[PDB]
């Protein structure tokens, strides 16, 4: 499972 970017969860 790849790690998400710092901002991947921001709208």
């Amino acid at each position, epitope marked *: 499972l*790849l*790690e*998400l*970017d*710092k*901002w*991947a969860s*921001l*709208w």
Partner: antibody
Amino acid sequence: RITLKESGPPLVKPTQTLTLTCSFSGFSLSDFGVGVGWIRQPPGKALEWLAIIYSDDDKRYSPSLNTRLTITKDTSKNQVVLVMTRVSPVDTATYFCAHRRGPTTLFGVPIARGPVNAMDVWGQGITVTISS
Amino acid sequence: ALQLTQSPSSLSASVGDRITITCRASQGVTSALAWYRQKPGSPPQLLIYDASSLESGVPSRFSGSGSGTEFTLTISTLRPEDFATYYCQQLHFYPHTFGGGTRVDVRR
């Protein structure tokens, strides 16, 4: 407006440590969510992502080089340093530092991801050769 | 592990031409895709961020499209300074990844 410049040794011997410094102007690393990243380009080859550090001291490394890479910052000096240990000739490349924008904020709180999705200003690049 | 595949890896064209380059991601990267132009001896220069947003100061002939796994960069009217190598980069997953590049040269 934003400028970045890499400095370091042009020549390093195998097994030694390479230290590159990025000095910048036009932004501050205390700006919310800002990043400074490193990318390299081996002679005749494509761009390769190395590492990133953010204003909150969050750091990420290329998984295949994370044993040899260390990224650090000095916010009052407007400098970011990349340290690479145990170099070999495979590490001969042009090294670029680059700026990543933080999110669109209103009242200092983020309202939009957009702008972060690129490295928007790059330094000129520094050529480093590893050889004995 | 994320792969970005650029196509074609090479193309030729002529001033005034319209060209299209595509990037496919092995996994969805939402809109987190940037396009760059690099001339020999120079650093990459940002054209398009967030898949379709035109970077300030970039000529209007550049445009980007797509979301998820499939992305396109379009130059409506090739100019002399556009003969160069183009890269995509995804910023949705760590590590950030660049594509292999697409070299655009003068046709004869």
